[PDB]
């Protein structure tokens, strides 16, 4: 019941291993000053074309359709980046990795859009967020100015960030949130369900001492964050269905299989 503080330094340490982008960094950018470097600001469709035309950044992107799609796709393959790390952090992470193949899938499949839409909150602030490795920043008038369908999905990971942001943690507190949604005993299939609850609970009594000790003064921190990884599963739940609409109504839209792959069947 100390040795908490051990399996949480494990935690934090596969994140600062894994992700390109932490929320340290994040912030110091945003917030201007540290970096004397200010991110170029996408606000239009000529900022759009400037970034692309080298000021920030094609990126192996399907062939062009229009700008509503060409962001689209700058998200996705963002999306899919992403992936690639929770499945590396998650691997740095010796139980997960003593799960079998399947098991491991399945975890992935049904946590990385929860997980992923906490940490685009690192990124966000009410206005907009950063983009190509902080070089960039993409404001939140230009995603909803898009054509819809594409106008909507952002919008409420925008909502729920800014909610989020509001409680201040820190990479070491995201490190043990994202894990705790990465091994979760409720994906549908699961076959090791005791092995994987078993590691979901240590995690998480690891996340309320981490909390107590890094946040002394918050009151409730712990039960909040409970109720954010449900949030969470509601909004991948909107997520998986509005991808669904643009499958159905967008179809010069290219998806990306693996994304595919996590949707079908959820
Ligand atoms: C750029 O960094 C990111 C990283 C993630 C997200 S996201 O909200 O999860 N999100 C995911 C997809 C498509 C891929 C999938 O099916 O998940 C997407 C498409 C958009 O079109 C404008 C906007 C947001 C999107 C947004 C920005």
Known sequence: VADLKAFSKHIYNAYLKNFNMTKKKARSILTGKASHTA??????????????KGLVWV????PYKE????????????????????????????????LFLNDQVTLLKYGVHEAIFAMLASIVNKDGLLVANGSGF?????????????????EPKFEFAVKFNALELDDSDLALFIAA?????????????????????????????????????????????????????????????????????????????????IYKDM
């Open 39 to 52: 991110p170029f600001v996408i606000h239009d469709i000529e900022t759009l074309w400037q970034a692309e």
């Open 181 to 261: 949604i990465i091994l979760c005993g409720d994906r549908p299939g699961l076959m090791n369900v005791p092995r994987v609850e078993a590691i979901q609970d240590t995690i998480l009594r690891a996340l309320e001492f981490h909390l107590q000790a890094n946040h002394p003064d918050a009151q409730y921190l712990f039960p909040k964050l409970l109720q954010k990884m449900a949030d969470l599963r509601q909004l991948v739940t909107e997520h998986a269905q509005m991808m669904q609409r643009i499958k159905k109504t967008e179809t010069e839209t290219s998806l990306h299989p693996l994304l595919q792959e």
């Open 59 to 62: 990126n192996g992107l399907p």
């Open 138 to 154: 993409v404001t939140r008038e230009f995603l909803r100015s898009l054509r819809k369908p594409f106008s909507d999905i952002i």
């Open 67 to 98: 700008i509503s799609v060409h962001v689209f796709y700058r998200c996705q393959c963002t999306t899919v980046e992403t992936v690639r790390e929770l499945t590396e952090f998650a691997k740095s992470i010796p139980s997960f990795s003593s």
